[PDB]
Design a protein around this ligand. Structure first.
Ligand SMILES: [Mg+2]
Ligand SMILES: [Mg+2]
Ligand SMILES: [Mg+2]
Ligand SMILES: [Mg+2]
Ligand SMILES: [Mg+2]
Ligand SMILES: [Mg+2]
Ligand SMILES: [Mg+2]
Ligand SMILES: [Mg+2]
Ligand SMILES: [Mg+2]
Ligand SMILES: [Mg+2]
Ligand SMILES: [Mg+2]
Ligand SMILES: [Mg+2]
Ligand SMILES: [Mg+2]
Ligand SMILES: [Mg+2]
Ligand SMILES: [Mg+2]
Ligand SMILES: [Mg+2]
Ligand SMILES: [Mg+2]
Lengths: 132, 177, 291, 185, 205
RNA sequence: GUAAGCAGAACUGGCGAUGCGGGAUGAACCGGAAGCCGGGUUACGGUGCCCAACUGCGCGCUAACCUAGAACCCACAAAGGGUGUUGGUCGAUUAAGACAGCAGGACGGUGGUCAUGGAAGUCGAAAUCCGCUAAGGAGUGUGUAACAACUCACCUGCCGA
RNA sequence: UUGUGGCAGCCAAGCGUUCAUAGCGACGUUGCUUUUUGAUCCUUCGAUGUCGGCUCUUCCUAUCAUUGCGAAGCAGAAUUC
RNA sequence: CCUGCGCCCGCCGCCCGCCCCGACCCACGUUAGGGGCGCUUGCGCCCCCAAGGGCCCGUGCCAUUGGCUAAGCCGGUCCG
């Protein structure tokens, strides 16, 4: 068995191009290579399956929804916040934030992990000596 | 973005002669990559069908036809005449695309692929939007199925941009469909 | 331009280059494949060709015309006094091939075998192994020698004994410098092989413990040397007519115009004899043991 | 080009099928049979708790869709070999010279003699699952039985092609050992 | 292919299930660019087209020899590491000083000898079989070709790898335990420090 | 002239007389013609390595157990084949049961016949109707010198797509 | 270059006591080869020693025998593709 | 075996020459699948995309004058 399918209502990441990082909803499949994808911020358009990545989220719709019906069903299944808090969808968000640390921020993080690094080692020494 | 091909109405007639101050006006729907190539192909058919050459003729109007509903999926039929290495043939095709411009681009591609036929050798007789329930080809029909579901059996492994390209990697790529 | 009449090629291309051997002692280029269920035996000796003579025997071979008849046969006598085992060598399998892991020598080495390590024995100090000998008289030294045995038992895939001849017992050989070689131990485990070899250091091996009666053996050695020889005797090509200008004993054509080179297959003049050879299935007719 | 091609087979309830990556191990009263299907590029899945084995080909061609029923056909032979087993039969066919078949050891080989009056002795061992026994009831038969239909069939074929007639017109010298009944017991 | 651009002292590449030609092409440009490459497990390199095509290709190669002096002729290597080295040499200008220097920077081995077993082994995605070959198209292993053309050290390479792979797996388990107690340490320290680590919460994954 | 990197003509251009970029290499093939330099951009041709430039973005076709195939000139391959595979065109059969496979089945005016030493059909075999029916040629070989049934096209039973 | 020389295909009227294709293959037609000759005159006339044999080696396959097979107008023996 | 006036080894006194600039990091295996963790030993849980990660006073004019110093970490050296 597989755990991800191209189908109606499946939400898929756009994993290549100028539009990298957006969630879209597959609303109809044109052929074996091209999908028709609609997201509430964009004009429904056909995209290739090579430029997408199927996620784990699904929403409960008909073929070719109406934008209002699409916007509704996204929130009813809570698409955005699920993507944002799961590990796959959080890796994207942090990797953006890590990019936006200015120099002084990178210094104060550099201070934080040196202190945290010391905590771990002295914590880890006490367990290593307590257990034999 | 741009479509490689565009649909044009081209309108033209013979030159007014000392008789026939109102020669008859002809129109076609043509496919070409710009207006200039559209006008040139108009005068091709009108020399060999209606016996009016560009020299003795006159160009009246040229307009681009666009798709009314680009956001929806239409089925399409194309009736085409082509030349092989040993003669001429008629061929019919089904395509699925959101615009008829997209449908034509696939057709030229599959003719150059499945038959090694070049664009200067194909004449499009008739184009249509064959509604489903009447599509003939089996490839087009298997997509006329709500509850359509299939996996991605081929999936490209590639960074979002070349900025993140490396040559070496610690672990093997992790793939599952 | 095909040759008019055909005949097989003269000489064998399989024994090239026909150069002088780089060795005086024959080299064992392959040992019998090992059979771990056999007991630990040796696989080779060093003998000295004494001469030839002939027997007359009577045959038993049903179906042959010689059945119940006599026959006369040439035989060669090889004098094979006992070997003396002085050392042990271990081998380990590596991706490139076989490799010597380590080696242990006996405490006492005769003057004959120690002559093997010098090119002028008499004016040297005869120091070879004079310090390795002291490893046998201190408990730290004995510890090493014993530890080296453990290493062979632990990792070796092949074990060989070092043995020398008692060259001094053949006075007809005006030689004092013994011949030394490695002889592989087949059979038994590596632990069995190391025990068999070390247990039997400084001692003598008769030819009986290795070869038996009526068994087939290969004989290895270097053939007689004949100096620089022309093509007729070296390769066996035919002589040319009597009336040839510049000589009969040659090869008339040494190649075609193309390739514009002389090929390695054509017969040339050069060294004849003193070549390494392995000769198979020489049968053993009689073992002669003193006493 | 076909989106989905799939076939299903039922699994009898006195045997148990354990498909791992594409290793279909089958176990039942007679023994265990295993086979490697890693070469197929299909999708195997037990459904209803082992009572059906449903095999899948996504976007296959005609050549690739040909594999579905072969794998299905194979797994049947693994099922039926573990309940009933397989048993081939061979007749001895000869014109003048009787052929003297003799077992090698514990029904694990045969030793065939006098075939076309030749002095040579023909040696052939049975493969792992196969035992061979001369038929007690029929004039000149040897009966091969085992779990794996393929190992039984190779043993039958081994004995047939080891009695080929050479040098002679085989439209008249029909002598040999041939497969009579190829059924499944 | 321009080059990695890396400042490593060397790059060890585990060539298992790479494509010989694609791997050789990547490695060749790296050597020209001044980098040093170690390639291990060359017995595991893959070649598209089955064993039969590759055997035929190699036996056509055995035919090529200088008729008048075969020892001078083309030198046909059997070991996979030497098969890899000659394929790379084909992709380098090896008759110049620059190409001689490039080939010096390459070491190729069958299996994973020391010290490269306790070193991290990188993979080249551009040449991996999973990404370059369509499942259902014939291929063979460079170890398999060598076995059938006269390489007599297949088994010794196999013996050595099993002992290494076993020796590496217990190390896997030893780090597996050490990873878990360190993880529990992570929590236990990160609760000892409260707000003091607040700056790390939005940049962690 | 069978032809030839052969012989002889017509128009134009090239080489000869000319370097330079590409065609791996070449007098006349493609681009393009030139003082000695800096910077920019192109043509032909290319962008996995050799080798400057993407292992770039797309869609199909090909799997070679013959050295698969891969550069205008240009360094060939033909007539003829393939149940390899992929697309088309013209027809057909199909729930009124199609194709395959398995068969009880092919019977009655009828050997009126056709061979007066042989044949509703069966060494052979001119040839046209009719009786039955969901139905079956007064049978090209179903093989019995000859009335016996399975194996053709023609309908039935079995199958259900 | 390939007329001529040599080898090989396709179609199938007939032979093969009946049967086009076991083995053949007329009238036609498509090729390959470069040990012939012819055609040409590009290289060499301030010189590349010009028949044959002898000697020696190597290479090709369009396979005569030897190994393993397939077909037959193959009973066996022999013979043929 | 290892040059009787020839050489070898070990410690510190360093001075050049050389490389480098954080020149830090070991699972196997497959990819029509796999990984970590608990308990039926298979089931649950969570994770699967790239080292795009982790680690490291990572912060002193290749690095100021002196003293002191936990716990922790890194080097040399001793032994096993
Ligand atoms: Mg000659
Ligand atoms: Mg000859
Ligand atoms: Mg002689
Ligand atoms: Mg004279
Ligand atoms: Mg480049
Ligand atoms: Mg001139
Ligand atoms: Mg410039
Ligand atoms: Mg075709
Ligand atoms: Mg000719
Ligand atoms: Mg001719
Ligand atoms: Mg001339
Ligand atoms: Mg001339
Ligand atoms: Mg001349
Ligand atoms: Mg001269
Ligand atoms: Mg001259
Ligand atoms: Mg000359
Ligand atoms: Mg041949």
């Amino acid at each position: 068995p597989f755990k991800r399918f191209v189908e109606i209502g499946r939400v898929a990441l756009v994993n290549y191009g100028k539009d990298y990082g957006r969630l879209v909803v597959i609303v109809d499949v044109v052929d074996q290579n091209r999908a028709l994808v609609d997201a509430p911020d964009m004009v429904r358009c056909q995209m290739n399956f090579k430029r997408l990545s199927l996620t784990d989220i699904k929403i409960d719709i008909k073929r070719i929804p109406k934008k209002a019906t699409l916007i509704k069903a996204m929130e009813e299944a809570d698409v955005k916040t699920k993507w944002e808090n799961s590990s796959w969808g959080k890796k994207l968000i942090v990797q953006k934030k890590r990019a936006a640390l200015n120099d002084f921020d990178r210094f104060k993080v550099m201070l934080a992990k040196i202190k945290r690094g010391g905590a771990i080692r002295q914590e880890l020494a006490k367990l290593k000596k307590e257990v034999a | 973005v741009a479509f490689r091909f565009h649909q044009y109405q081209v309108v033209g007639r013979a030159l007014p002669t000392p008789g026939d101050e109102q020669p008859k006006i002809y129109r076609m729907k043509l496919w070409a990559t710009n207006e200039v190539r559209a006008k040139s192909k108009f005068w091709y058919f009108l020399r060999k069908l209606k016996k009016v050459k560009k020299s003795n003729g006159q160009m009246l109007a040229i307009n681009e036809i666009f798709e009314k509903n680009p956001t929806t999926i239409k089925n399409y039929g194309i009736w085409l005449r082509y030349q092989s290495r040993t003669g001429y043939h008629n061929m019919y095709k089904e395509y699925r695309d959101t615009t008829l411009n997209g449908a034509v681009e696939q057709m030229y591609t599959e003719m150059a692929s499945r038959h090694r036929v070049r664009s200067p050798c194909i004449q499009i007789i008739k184009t249509a939007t064959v509604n489903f329930k009447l599509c003939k080809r089996d490839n087009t029909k298997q997509f006329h199925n709500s509850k359509i579901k299939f996996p991605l059996v081929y999936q490209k492994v590639r960074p979002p941009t070349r900025k993140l390209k490396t040559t070496y990697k610690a672990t093997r790529p992790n793939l599952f469909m | 331009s095909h040759r008019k009449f055909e005949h097989p090629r003269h000489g064998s291309l399989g024994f090239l280059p026909r150069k002088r051997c780089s060795r005086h002692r024959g080299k064992v280029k392959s040992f019998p494949k090992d059979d771990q269920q056999k007991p630990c035996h040796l696989t080779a000796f060093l003998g000295y060709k004494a001469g030839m003579t002939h027997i007359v025997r009577e045959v038993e071979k049903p179906g042959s015309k010689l059945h119940k008849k006599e026959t006369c046969e040439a035989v060669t006598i090889i004098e094979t006094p006992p070997l003396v085992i002085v050392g042990l060598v271990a081998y380990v399998k590596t991706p490139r091939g076989l490799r010597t892991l380590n080696s242990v020598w006996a405490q006492h080495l005769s003057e004959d075998v120690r002559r093997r390590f010098y090119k002028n024995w008499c004016k040297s100090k005869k120091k070879a192994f004079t310090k390795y000998a002291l490893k046998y008289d201190s408990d730290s030294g004995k510890k090493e020698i014993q530890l080296q045995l453990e290493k062979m038992k632990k990792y070796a895939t092949i074990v060989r004994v070092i043995a020398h001849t008692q060259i001094r017992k053949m006075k007809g050989l005006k030689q004092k410098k013994a011949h030394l070689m490695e002889i592989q131990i087949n059979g038994g485990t590596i632990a069995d092989k190391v025990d068999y070899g070390y247990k039997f250091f400084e001692k003598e091996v008769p030819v009986e413990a290795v070869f038996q009666k009526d068994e087939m053996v290969d004989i290895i050695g270097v053939t007689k040397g004949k100096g620089y020889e022309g093509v007729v005797t070296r390769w066996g090509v035919t002589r040319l007519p009597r009336k040839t200008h510049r000589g009969l004993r040659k090869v008339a054509c040494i190649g075609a115009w193309h390739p514009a080179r002389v090929s390695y297959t054509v017969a040339r003049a050069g060294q004849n004899g003193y070549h390494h050879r392995t000769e198979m299935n020489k049968k053993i007719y009689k073992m002669g043991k003193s006493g | 080009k076909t989106i989905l091609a799939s076939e299903t087979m039922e699994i009898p309830e006195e045997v148990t099928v354990k498909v791992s990556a594409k290793m279909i191990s089958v176990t039942g009263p007679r023994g265990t049979l295993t086979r490697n299907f890693k070469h197929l590029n299909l999708d195997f899945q037990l459904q209803e708790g082992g009572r059906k084995l449903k095999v899948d080909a996504w976007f296959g061609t005609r050549k690739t869709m040909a594999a579905i029923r072969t794998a299905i056909s194979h797994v049947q032979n693994l099922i039926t070999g573990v309940t009933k087993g397989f048993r081939y039969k061979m007749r001895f066919v000869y014109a003048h010279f009787p052929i003297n078949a003799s077992i090698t050891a514990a029904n694990r080989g045969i030793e065939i003699r006098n075939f076309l009056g030749e002095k040579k002795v023909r040696k052939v061992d049975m493969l792992d699952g196969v035992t061979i026994l001369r038929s007690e009831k029929v004039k000149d038969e040897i009966v091969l039985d085992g779990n794996d239909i393929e190992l039984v069939s190779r043993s039958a074929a081994l004995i047939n092609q080891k009695c080929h007639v050479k040098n002679k017109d085989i439209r008249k010298f029909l002598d040999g050992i041939y497969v009579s009944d190829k059924g499944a017991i | 292919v321009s080059g990695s651009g890396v400042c490593a002292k060397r790059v060890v590449v585990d060539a298992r299930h790479h494509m010989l030609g694609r791997l050789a092409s990547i490695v060749a440009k790296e050597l020209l660019n001044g980098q040093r490459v170690v390639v291990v497990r060359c017995e595991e390199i893959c070649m598209s087209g089955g064993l039969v095509r590759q055997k035929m290709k190699y036996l056509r190669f055995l035919r090529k020899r200088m008729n008048t002096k075969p020892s001078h002729g083309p030198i046909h290597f059997r070991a996979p590491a030497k098969i890899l080295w000659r394929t790379i040499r084909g992709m380098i200008p090896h008759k110049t000083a620059r190409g001689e220097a490039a080939l010096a920077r390459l070491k190729a081995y069958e299996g994973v000898p020391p010290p490269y077993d306790r070193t991290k082994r990188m993979v080249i995605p551009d040449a991996l079989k999973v990404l370059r070959l369509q499942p259902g198209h014939r291929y063979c292993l460079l170890g398999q070709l060598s076995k059938e053309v006269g390489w007599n050290y297949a088994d010794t390479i196999r013996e050595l790898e099993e002992k290494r792979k076993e020796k590496a797996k217990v190390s896997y388990d030893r780090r597996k335990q050490l990873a878990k107690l360190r993880v529990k340490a992570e929590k236990a320290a990160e609760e000892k420090l409260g707000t003091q680590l607040e700056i790390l919460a939005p940049i962690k994954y």
